[PDB]
Design a protein around this ligand. Structure first.
Ligand SMILES: Cc1nc(Nc2ncc(C(=O)Nc3c(C)cccc3Cl)s2)cc(N2CCN(CCO)CC2)n1
Length: 243
């Protein structure tokens, strides 16, 4: 794979990171200079290939792969603050609501980019975003989530740009509720029934009525009445200016 093939001996491994959703992820350095995360998989056909064609400041950036050797490596930029869901549940951060809104805006920018590329993420949720050292949120794992799915997906499997819009609204709720599970008091069956009847996530305490109006707009029962990510972006930026 061209300049995407990385020389494994340009890699050092500095610390262990996980095994519970991946296959060993490690923090290491590339070319003695760049912090990377290194994903070692085992017996890929699609993940890096997706990641080779997409590039945005708000999408976790592929640096390269190791394909000519043992277990395959995928190497990306390193996200020092880990998954967004864990970051939000860490109470020491004591976030201000302007920080929470900026997290929404980060993800919204990534999704507007993907939308412009006609690419559907399909599993957008806080667990699939990561956070770097500066607190910037980036969309990840883009290479069944009942609580992030609109009625047309639960009932008919009708995926579309508007089903990513729905999940993004639920992701804003996850941010403003500091990492709560959506529909925390319900089973998956109950969530599906209750969403099909028109009930929606309540306004988080930290979300202003303007912010809640944005997330609520993602949840129109008619998919074609939901905004695009371009419109959600402009709306979020408007709220940031109003403060
Ligand atoms: C599991 C984990 N990842 C971290 N950072 C990452 N950056 C990049 C990663 C990654 O997976 N990229 C990637 C992708 C997206 C696709 C294909 C291939 C790859 Cl390689 S994972 C940080 C972290 N921390 C846990 C503990 N911490 C405080 C909480 O206690 C902060 C440090 N934990």
């Amino acid at each position: 794979y061209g300049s995407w093939e990385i020389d494994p001996k340009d890699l050092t491994f500095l610390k262990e990171l996980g095994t519970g959703q991946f296959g060993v992820v490690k923090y290491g350095k590339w070319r003695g200079q760049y912090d990377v995360a290194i994903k070692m998989i085992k017996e890929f056909i699609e993940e890096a290939k997706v990641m080779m064609n997409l590039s945005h400041e708000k999408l976790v950036q592929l640096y390269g792969v190791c394909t000519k050797q043992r277990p395959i490596f995928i190497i990306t930029e390193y996200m020092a603050n880990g998954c967004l869901l864990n970051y939000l549940r860490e109470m020491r951060h004591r976030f201000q609501t302007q920080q929470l809104l900026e997290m929404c805006k980060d993800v919204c920018e990534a999704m507007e980019y993907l939308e412009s590329k006609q690419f559907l993420h399909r599993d957008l949720a806080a667990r699939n975003c990561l956070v770097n050292d500066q607190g910037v949120v980036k969309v990840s794992d883009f290479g069944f989530p009942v609580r992030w799915s609109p009625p047309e997906v639960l009932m008919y499997s009708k995926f579309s740009s508007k089903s990513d819009i729905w999940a993004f609204g639920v992701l804003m709720w996850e941010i403003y509720s500091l990492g709560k599970m959506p529909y925390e008091r319900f089973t998956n069956s109950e969530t599906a029934e209750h969403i099909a009847q028109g009930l929606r996530l309540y306004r988080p305490h930290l979300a202003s009525e303007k912010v809640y109006t944005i997330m609520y707009s993602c949840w129109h029962e008619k998919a074609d009445e939901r905004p695009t990510f371009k419109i959600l972006l402009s709306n979020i930026l408007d709220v940031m200016d109003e403060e």
